[PDB]
Amino acid sequence: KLVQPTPLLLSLLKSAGAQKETFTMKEVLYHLGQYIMAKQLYDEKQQHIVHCSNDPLGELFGVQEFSVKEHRRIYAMISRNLV
């Protein structure tokens, strides 16, 4: 069952390379992960946290930072941004 990102979430994914309006969750995760790499939001050095205090992302997930290994939380954050 495909996900349909909200216009917000979509503009991110589109600026992250996505070329369509509906996705598999893995596809969302792939572009977002690619969005995070582009905005350099990710310190591998630190402790695998993404830092988005001042990105559209952080505003979208209603969070300042998260570990890239709190998948259960990363999924919920996304879920509230799918139509």
Ligand X SMILES: CC(C)(C)C[C@@H]1N[C@@H](C(=O)NCC[C@H](O)CO)[C@H](c2cccc(Cl)c2F)[C@@]1(C#N)c1ccc(Cl)cc1F
69 binds ligand X (CB under 6 A): yes
56 binds ligand X (CB under 6 A): no
33 binds ligand X (CB under 6 A): yes
Query: Rounded CA gap, 42 and 19, in Å?
Result: 24
| Three-class SS state of 51 | strand
Q: Most distant CA pair in the chain: distance in Å?
A: 36
Q: Please identify which residue in 3, 32, 52, 60 interacts with ligand X, judged by CB under 6 A.
A: 32
Q: Which residues bind ligand X (CB under 6 A)?
A: 29, 32-33, 36-37, 42, 48, 68-69, 71, 74-75
